[PDB]
Design a protein around this ligand. Structure first.
Ligand SMILES: [Cl-]
Ligand SMILES: [Cl-]
Ligand SMILES: [Cl-]
Lengths: 357, 357, 357
C-alpha cells in the first residue's frame, strides 16, 4: 500500500483538560487502539488532556511537534507516543503509530453526550404509514410524516421534524430541533447538529416585467454515508433533480448549500461557507471558513480554498486558492485601498515611463 | 406598453429531471400557460426535465441559448419553445412567448410538497384572543399567542411560534419551525422557510464606561405582500419604528436583516447577505451571495452588487458594484497581497521617477 | 475617577417613533433616570421618538450632533438634553448628563415584550432530577433534561431544549426555540434570542488516509454574566476544556463561535462574525459585521476590526484593523482586480526602471 499524508495534520490541536466520572485502566484504553503499554497497564485513567495541561490521572498524547519540548515535563499519567518518542521516556508510554488518531478514537470513551434508549416518546407524532425501526429512538414532540423511514439504531432528538417520504439510514444521529423537508434521502451514520434545515426551497425565481415569479423546487436531497452537518446549516432541495452530498462529507456550522449543488466524497467545509446553486465540488477538497462559491462552476479533486475567498470560476488544477487582501492597521489599509483604485492609472503611467526611458 | 428585459435571464438554468406519479396531458399543461400545441395534445406527461436530461414522458423547455444546439437531439416528449425555435422542430412543440416562464408556472403542477387541510391540530396552543381563520391550517405543537391574527388560507407548520399581536395575511405559508416575535405584521402570500426568525431583538447597546447598556427594541416588523424568506434567515424588529420589507421582496437563506433596515419592492437578496442597521435599499435591486452593507446608507433603485462585496457607502447611480480581489493560486495571491501593502510606497516612487524623467 | 469616552458614541442613532398604550408622567420618567425637569412634570408621555419624528405626547432626546440643528423645531412633548442644550430651549427639557443613556434606560418602560408569570407549562417536560426555581417560567413544549438547573427569575421560552446538567443563572431570558446541549453553564442575566444553539459539536476531525475521523467533543461551554446572544447564533462546545465567553459580552445575530474560543469581558461582535477554533479575543474589543478570525490566534484588549475583514494573525497592539478593497462600480473594479494580479510584475518593472534612471 502507498503511504498517505495530509497537510491538515499541521494544524495546532486545541489545548485542554477533561476530568471524567468514568474510569478505564490504561490496559483497557490501550486495547481499544492497539497500543503497546510500556509501563504499568493497571493505572486507572479518569480523563484526557494535552501535555502541559494533563495531571497524573489523565492520558495525554503528542500531536504537534511544537509541544514535543514539553513531553518530559508533562504530569500526565501516561502518554500516547510514537516508538521514537517513547524511547527514553521516563513515564508510561502507550506506543502507537499515530497518537492523535488514537486520541480521536479514545475521546469517545469519555463522551458525556446523552444516549437515548430505543423507543418512541409518547408525545411524538408518527404517521401510520411511516416506518420507525424498533431499535430507533424518537424524542419528545418529534413529528415523523407520511412514508418516512427511520432506520435501525437511529436517534431522533426532541422537536425534530422528519418530512414526508424522507429516509434516515442505520446508525444516524439527529440532535434536537433538526428539520428535514419531504423527499430527503440520507444514508448511514449521519450526524446532524441542532437547527440544521435539510431540503428547504432555495431561491428559485424568474424575473417577469420586474416581478419575481416562483419556480417550484420539485427535486429532493440525497446525502451519502458518514456525513456530518453542523448547527444551523442549511441544504436546499433541488429544482428538478436532487441536491447531492457524497460519502464522508463533513460540513461545519452555519453553512449554506444551495439547490443542485454536488459535493464529492470526503470533502470538508468549514463554518460559514456558502455554495451557490449548481456548483460541483470534487473529492478530498477543503473549503476554509467563510469561503463562497459562485454558481455553476466545478472544482476538481484535491483543492483547498483559504478563508473568506470568493471563488469565481471553475478550478481544474489541484492546489490552494485565495482571494482578498492582507490585514493591516486600518489607517494603513485605507492608503492601500486608495492606491488599488489608482492601479489602472498607475499601470498606464508605468508603461509611459518605460517608453520614455 | 414598453418592452421589458432583465439581465438575470442570462443565468444558467439548473439541469435536471423529475419523474412524477402525477400525470397531465400536453393539452392540460398547454392550457395552463396559454401554449399552442404543435402536435398531439393527448400525450400524457409524467414529469419535467431540461433538454439533454429529458425522456419521452417528460415536457422540456429551451431557456439558455447555450443549449439550443441540443434541441434536435432531446428525447423529451414535447418542448416549450418560442415560435422561432418551433419552426422546423421535428417533435411536439408547445409554443409560448417565454419557455422558462411557462416552465416556472408548470413546475407547481408537479410539486410534491405537503398541503395541509384546514383546521387546528389538537396539540396546537391558540390563545383565546388570537383569531385563526377557519380556512387556515395550524400544525402540531404550534403556539399562537394573544392577539395574533392568522388569515384565510394560511398554512402554519408544526412547531411554529406566532408572537403576540402578530399578523399573517391571506394565503401565507410558513414551513415548520418558523418563529415570529410579537408585533410582526405580514401581508398576503408570504412564504417562509424553516428556521427563520422574524422580529428578534438585534444588537442595541450603548457604551457606558466600557460596559454595554441594553436599549429596548420596541418597534416591530412590517412585511409586504408576496415576500419570500429563506431558511434560517433573521429579520430584527425596529428600535422605535418598524423594520420594513416591501412587496415582492425575495430573500434567500441565512440572510441577516438588522434593525430598522428598509427594503424596497421587488428587491432580491441571495444567501448569506448581511444588512446592517438602518440601511435602506431601493426597488428592483439585487444583492449577490454574501454581500454585506454597512449601516445608515442608502442604495438607489436598479443596483446590483456582486458576490461577497462590502458596501461601505450610499449608492446614488444605478449599476453594478463590486469589492474584493480576483481569486489566484495561493502562492500567487500571497505575492499580490504583499505588493498591495507596498502600494503607497510604490506610488510615491512612481511619482519621484516621473519627476526625474 | 478618570473620564471615559468611546468612539462607538459617534454612530448614528436610528430614527423612529413609538406610540404606546402605556403612559407615564414626565416626572415619573425623570425620576427613573435622575433628570431635572425644566418645565411641567405633570405632562403624560405615551411614547418615545427621535427629534424630527416626535410628536407632543412623546419624549425625545438629542444623541447625535448632526441633529442638534433640528432641536428648536422638534414637536416633542419634552426632550432629554445636556445642561448646555437645555439653556435657551423653548420647551420642557429633562436635563441629564447623557441623553442617549437616559433614553436607553427609559426604552424598557415602554417595551411590549411578553412577560411570563412564574410556573411550568403543563406541556413542559422536566426531568425529575432537574431543578427549576419556583420563580422561573418554563413555556409550552420546553424540555428540561436531567440535572439541569434553572435559576430564580429565569424565563424559558416555548420549545426550548435545556440539555443535561446545563445551568442558567438568575434573571436569564431565553426566547422561544433556544437549544442548549449538555454541560452548558451560563451565569446571571443572560439574554438569548430565538434559534441560538449553544454547545453543539463543531468540526472535530482528523484525516486518516483521506477519510475524516470524528473526535468526540467532550468539553462544554462556560458563559459569564450579562451576556447577549443573537438570533440563530451558534457557540460550539469545547474539545476537552470549555469554550469560554466572558462577562458583558454582546453577540449579535448569526454569529459562529467555534470550539475552544475564548472571548474576554465586554467585547462586542456584530452580526455574521465567524471565529475559528481556539481564537482568543481580549476585553473591550469590537468586531464589525461579517468579520472572520482564523484559528489559534490572540487579539489583545481594545481592538476594533472593520466589516468583512479576514483576521489572519495575532494582534498585539490596540487599534483598528481592516482587509479587503474599496467598493467600485463593477467595470472599474474589474480593471483594479486585473492590475492587482499584475502587481508582482509591476513591482519588478518599477525596480528595473529605478536602476535605469
Ligand atoms: Cl500536542
Ligand atoms: Cl435550457
Ligand atoms: Cl439624535
Amino acid at each position: 500500500s502507498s503511504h498517505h499524508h495530509h497537510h491538515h495534520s499541521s494544524g495546532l490541536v486545541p489545548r485542554g483538560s477533561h476530568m471524567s466520572t468514568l474510569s478505564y485502566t490504561l490496559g483497557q484504553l490501550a486495547a481499544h487502539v492497539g497500543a503497546e503499554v510500556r509501563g504499568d497497564a493497571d493505572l486507572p485513567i479518569q480523563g484526557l488532556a494535552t501535555l502541559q495541561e494533563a495531571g497524573p490521572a489523565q492520558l495525554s498524547f503528542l500531536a504537534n511537534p511544537q509541544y514535543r519540548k514539553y513531553l518530559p515535563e508533562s504530569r500526565a499519567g501516561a502518554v500516547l507516543l510514537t516508538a521514537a518518542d517513547a524511547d527514553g521516556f521516563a513515564g508510561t508510554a502507550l506506543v502507537v503509530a499515530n497518537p492523535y488518531l488514537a486520541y480521536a478514537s479514545l475521546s469517545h470513551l469519555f463522551d458525556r453526550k446523552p444516549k437515548a434508549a430505543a423507543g418512541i416518546h409518547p408525545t411524538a407524532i408518527v404517521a401510520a404509514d411511516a416506518e420507525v425501526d424498533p431499535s430507533a429512538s424518537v424524542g419528545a414532540y418529534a413529528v415523523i410524516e407520511s412514508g418516512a423511514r427511520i432506520g435501525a439504531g437511529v436517534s431522533i432528538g426532541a422537536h425534530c421534524v422528519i418530512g414526508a417520504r424522507s429516509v434516515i439510514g442505520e446508525g444516524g444521529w439527529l440532535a434536537p430541533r433538526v428539520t428535514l423537508y419531504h423527499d430527503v434521502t440520507i444514508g448511514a451514520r449521519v450526524s446532524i447538529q441542532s437547527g440544521a434545515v435539510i431540503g428547504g426551497e432555495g431561491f428559485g425565481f424568474a424575473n417577469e416585467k420586474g416581478v419575481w415569479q416562483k419556480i417550484a423546487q420539485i427535486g429532493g436531497v440525497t446525502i451519502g454515508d458518514d456525513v456530518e452537518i453542523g448547527a444551523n446549516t442549511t441544504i436546499d432541495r433541488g429544482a428538478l433533480s436532487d441536491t447531492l452530498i457524497g460519502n464522508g462529507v463533513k460540513l461545519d456550522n452555519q453553512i449554506m448549500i444551495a439547490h443542485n449543488v454536488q459535493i464529492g466524497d470526503h470533502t470538508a467545509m468549514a463554518a460559514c461557507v456558502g455554495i451557490s446553486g449548481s456548483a460541483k465540488i470534487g473529492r478530498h477538497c477543503m473549503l476554509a471558513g467563510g469561503v463562497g462559491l459562485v454558481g455553476h462552476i466545478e472544482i476538481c479533486d484535491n483543492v483547498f480554498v483559504t478563508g473568506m475567498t470568493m471563488v469565481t470560476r471553475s478550478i481544474t488544477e489541484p492546489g490552494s486558492y485565495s482571494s482578498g487582501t492582507a490585514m493591516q492597521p486600518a489607517a494603513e489599509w485605507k492608503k492601500s485601498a486608495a492606491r488599488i483604485r489608482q492601479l489602472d492609472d498607475m499601470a498606464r503611467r508605468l508603461q509611459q515611463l518605460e517608453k520614455r526611458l
